[PDB]
Structure 1
Amino acid sequence: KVQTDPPSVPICDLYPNGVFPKGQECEYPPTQDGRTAAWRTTSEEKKALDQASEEIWNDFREAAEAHRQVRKYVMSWIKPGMTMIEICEKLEDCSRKLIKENGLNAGLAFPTGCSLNNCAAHYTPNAGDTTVLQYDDICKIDFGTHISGRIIDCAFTVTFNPKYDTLLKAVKDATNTGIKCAGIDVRLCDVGEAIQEVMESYEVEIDGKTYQVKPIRNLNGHSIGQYRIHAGKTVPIIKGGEATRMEEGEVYAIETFGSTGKGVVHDDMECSHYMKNFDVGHVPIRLPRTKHLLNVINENFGTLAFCRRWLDRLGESKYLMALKNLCDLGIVDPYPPLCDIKGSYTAQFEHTILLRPTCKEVVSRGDDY
């Protein structure tokens, strides 16, 4: 009863029983008294709690399998010479098909980030962007999928010149350290301190200059909520930050960013990412164009992030002022590209993890990273 598998068959159609593959399952890290998590691994009480939200975990897994298959595909063809628009459209086209896009029930969780070099996040081309990926570019591919609002935020870094190899290794190791440190009752600040320690243990040499990799201090991981990419809690990336503990049942985006610059990002370049304020309720709007755009946003994205290209594909035109109005009203928030100093290089690696009652599941883990 098999069939096609190349990037064209929806993940849902690949599993008739509706049960999707689990990600990497890890035992929760010990504590002071060396209290391991071997007991919680099968605990009858926890096993029940976990099984109670099996439908939720399952949805994350379906979205994760889509993410794994989409990215494996992307890595096979992304090459310098392609425009950033060509890259994002080809990736998104596949993502939409594998996730079996269905309105707000299944689809793309957020725009395809493809931030270059000193820019670390939130850059995706808008219409007319002629930017071309270069051999020496360090591109952060950050895209998301979701099933019923259960979001998979996962990212990796693309390079073609081996000179960035140790920088990527540093960030990948830092992210895996954060993933290993994460757990129920674990203080967020400890995760950040652990991440910084690993990150900074790496020194790299690029074009004759040496650098001690720096975590981007004002960037971080975050808890994830249904249809809410950033539920409220933040996972630092450096020491001294977040005096809160991770809790059972929570879901986190564990990401780290390393940089050869100041280790700080600032808003720069034209904005492409936007997202309705999760807390803003219904707001009556009479302005025709603004009213229509808000309706389009509510129908197609809800509280999920979107980009200008996604408005263009829906047939919307000359909507910039309306979009600005929504932002000025506080109904929608702009999320411009976040970049370090000109000339610097930034790298990123990210995974979504489920803090399940019985274990810690790195649901987006793959054979690649």
Structure 2
Amino acid sequence: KVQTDPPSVPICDLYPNGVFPKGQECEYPPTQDGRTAAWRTTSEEKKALDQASEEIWNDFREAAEAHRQVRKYVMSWIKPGMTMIEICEKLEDCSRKLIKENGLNAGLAFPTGCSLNNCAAHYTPNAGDTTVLQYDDICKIDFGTHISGRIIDCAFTVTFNPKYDTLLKAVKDATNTGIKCAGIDVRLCDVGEAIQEVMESYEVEIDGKTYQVKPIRNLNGHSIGQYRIHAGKTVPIVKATRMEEGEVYAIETFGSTGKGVVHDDMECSHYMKNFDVGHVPIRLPRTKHLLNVINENFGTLAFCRRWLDRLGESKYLMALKNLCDLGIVDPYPPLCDIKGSYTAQFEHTILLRPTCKEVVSRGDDY
């Protein structure tokens, strides 16, 4: 069984024994004292603790292989002229097939971000959105896959105009720096300081205007937990907490030609149940029904309004507002820098395994 073009064969069909390709394996960086952390690669104790979690790493790898094949497919057809809805539906249809969607056991970890220009994150079109991808747009494709709640959070920036090439290079270099400097016992702020230094070393010229690339200071990388996109630890992308063994990180950076600060803008499309909210009894019929739809289909995973529409749900906006007002569900509105500014993003999921650092979502693309 080999992959077709367009991809349609599930990843678990391409690897019947359920052993999926490893990501990029990295030796841990040397500590601030000068001593190498290379011993972990050959430590018999660390090798044992690593094989104990083999099923876990293996679920991330399946989800990461689905991510590589879905993004390679998107890159071959994403073009100006397409509506944002068309782009998201074509990507998600492929993602559902390759991950072999199965309720909460395999599926889409979160909505397809396709944030444009000054908007950096958390924009996906709602029903009726007529936005069309333009030749001069700088589009952030940020989509997720999961196997048993082992989430792949991985993203890249799409452009058609070479005027953004050095802005893309700056952010790609900064993400790769963040990835290189991450490791067991490394302070989160040290990863952030390294990201910022690389980012700000770049100057770009776009349409006769020049800018020094700014990291978006209120956007950050994060630890990932089972069915939990943000497990609680923050990886700043600017200058106390340490990364720990067995942890999973989304290393992401955003570079901007604006203020380097995002604000809540436009209408909301992304929502997610607050992970720490227990069972809340609801009597309001439409609100009760919507929370049941959310619990059954998404659990603590992020969703968007288009995903409620595809489930046959209608007249749910007040119900959704009630869930947000009760603090059961949190809205995640688009995050945008100033009008006329340009933002780019690159993101990978990394596994802090006992033996090595695995950039599980690494591809031959980025």
TM tier, smaller: over 0.9
Mark the CA change 1:99 to 1:2 in structure 2 (over 3 Å): closer, same or farther.
Answer: closer
Deviation at 1:34, TM superposition (A): 2.4
Deviation at 1:308, TM superposition (A): 0.1
Query: 1:316-355 CA distances to partner (integer Å, 9 max, x unpaired)?
Result: 0010000000000000000000000000000000000000
| Cα distance in 1 for residues equivalent to 2:307 and 2:97 | 16
Q: Report if the CA contact (8 A) 2:124-2:269 is conserved.
A: yes
Deviation at 1:31, TM superposition (A): 1.1
Task: Name the counterpart of 1:299.
Answer: 296
Mark the CA change 1:5 to 1:132 in structure 2 (over 3 Å): closer, same or farther.
Answer: closer
Query: 1:219-274 CA distances to partner (integer Å, 9 max, x unpaired)?
Result: 000000000000000000001xxx21000000000000000000000000000000
Q: Report if the CA contact (8 A) 2:31-2:37 is conserved.
A: no
| Cα distance in 2 for residues equivalent to 1:161 and 1:7 | 27
| Cα distance in 2 for residues equivalent to 1:355 and 1:40 | 11
Deviation at 1:35, TM superposition (A): 2.0
| Cα distance in 2 for residues equivalent to 1:200 and 1:247 | 28
Tell me which stretches of 4 or more aligned residues in structure 1 moved more than 6 Å.
none
| Cα distance in 1 for residues equivalent to 2:100 and 2:317 | 29
| Cα distance in 2 for residues equivalent to 1:33 and 1:136 | 47
| Cα distance in 1 for residues equivalent to 2:349 and 2:3 | 29
Tell me, what secondary structure is at the counterpart of 1:72?
A: helix
Deviation at 1:191, TM superposition (A): 0.4
Mark the CA change 1:53 to 1:133 in structure 2 (over 3 Å): closer, same or farther.
Answer: same
Deviation at 1:2, TM superposition (A): 4.8
| Cα distance in 1 for residues equivalent to 2:82 and 2:157 | 16
| Cα distance in 2 for residues equivalent to 1:32 and 1:323 | 48
Deviation at 1:309, TM superposition (A): 0.0
Tell me, what secondary structure is at the counterpart of 2:39?
A: coil
Deviation at 1:143, TM superposition (A): 0.2
| Cα distance in 2 for residues equivalent to 1:305 and 1:238 | 26
Structure 2: give runs of 5+ residues left out of the alignment.
none
| Cα distance in 2 for residues equivalent to 1:196 and 1:131 | 32
Mark the CA change 1:2 to 1:347 in structure 2 (over 3 Å): closer, same or farther.
Answer: closer
Mark the CA change 1:62 to 1:203 in structure 2 (over 3 Å): closer, same or farther.
Answer: same
| Cα distance in 1 for residues equivalent to 2:48 and 2:348 | 26
| Cα distance in 2 for residues equivalent to 1:6 and 1:15 | 18
| Cα distance in 2 for residues equivalent to 1:330 and 1:35 | 47
| Cα distance in 2 for residues equivalent to 1:368 and 1:114 | 18
Mark the CA change 1:2 to 1:309 in structure 2 (over 3 Å): closer, same or farther.
Answer: closer
Correspondence for 1:267 among 264, 268, 277: 264
Residues paired across the two proteins, number:
366
| Cα distance in 2 for residues equivalent to 1:174 and 1:3 | 33
Deviation at 1:134, TM superposition (A): 0.1
Deviation at 1:4, TM superposition (A): 4.2
Query: 1:59-88 CA distances to partner (integer Å, 9 max, x unpaired)?
Result: 000000000000000000000000000000
Query: 1:169-221 CA distances to partner (integer Å, 9 max, x unpaired)?
Result: 00000000000000000000000000000000000000001000000000000
Q: Report if the CA contact (8 A) 2:50-2:353 is conserved.
A: yes
Task: Name the counterpart of 1:252.
Answer: 249
Structure 1: give runs of 5+ residues left out of the alignment.
none
Q: Report if the CA contact (8 A) 2:259-2:338 is conserved.
A: yes
Tell me, what secondary structure is at the counterpart of 2:350?
A: strand
Deviation at 1:5, TM superposition (A): 6.3
Mark the CA change 1:280 to 1:80 in structure 2 (over 3 Å): closer, same or farther.
Answer: same
Mark the CA change 1:136 to 1:38 in structure 2 (over 3 Å): closer, same or farther.
Answer: same
Q: Report if the CA contact (8 A) 2:256-2:341 is conserved.
A: yes
| Cα distance in 2 for residues equivalent to 1:184 and 1:211 | 35
| Cα distance in 1 for residues equivalent to 2:226 and 2:2 | 33
TM-score scaled by structure 2? 0.99
Correspondence for 2:275 among 271, 274, 278: 278
Correspondence list, 1:122-271, <5 A: 122-239=122-239, 243-271=240-268
Query: 1:119-168 CA distances to partner (integer Å, 9 max, x unpaired)?
Result: 00000000000000000000000000000000000000000000000000
TM-score scaled by structure 1? 0.98
Tell me, what secondary structure is at the counterpart of 1:298?
A: helix
Deviation at 1:16, TM superposition (A): 1.2
Query: 1:267-320 CA distances to partner (integer Å, 9 max, x unpaired)?
Result: 000000000000000010000000000000000000000000000000000100
Q: Report if the CA contact (8 A) 2:223-2:249 is conserved.
A: yes
| Cα distance in 1 for residues equivalent to 2:246 and 2:32 | 22
Task: Name the counterpart of 1:309.
Answer: 306
Tell me, what secondary structure is at the counterpart of 1:39?
A: helix
Q: Report if the CA contact (8 A) 2:228-2:300 is conserved.
A: yes
